[PDB]
Write a protein that binds this ligand. Structure first.
Ligand code: HEC
Length: 89
């Protein structure tokens, strides 16, 4: 009910382009650890993920006006955890 919320948020809003941690729109801009340290502003850290979800980037939409801060934290922890544990799909 935090990490699960994040998984809940991931599935409902993120899976459309990040199915299984990949990136349908920008294939290279993947959700696994290596891609994140390479492409994510600020690097691989939960705070950088949060910032990208809130603000969006390029073809990635901003979720600040749709999700709560709490869910944005939750989903960032989820992405962070999946990449660290390499649990994608
Ligand atoms: C498709 C319309 C998208 C939805 C739905 C979400 N994201 Fe996304 N994301 C998408 C693109 C096109 C990009 C790259 C943007 C760019 O031009 O750089 C991204 C990137 C990410 C990343 C960074 C991945 C990396 O750099 O390797 C993260 C952390 C990310 N996206 C997370 C994320 C979450 C948690 C979403 C659900 C709320 C979400 N994205 C939705 C396309 C789309």
């Amino acid at each position: 009910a935090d990490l699960a919320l994040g998984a809940q948020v991931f599935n409902g809003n993120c899976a459309a382009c990040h199915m299984g941690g990949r990136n349908s729109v920008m294939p290279e801009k993947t959700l696994d650890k290596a891609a994140l340290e390479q492409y994510l502003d600020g690097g691989f850290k939960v705070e950088s993920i949060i910032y990208q979800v809130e603000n969006g980037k390029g073809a990635m939409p901003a979720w600040a006006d749709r999700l709560s801060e709490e869910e944005i934290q939750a989903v960032a922890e989820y992405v962070f955890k999946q990449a660290t544990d390499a649990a994608w799909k």
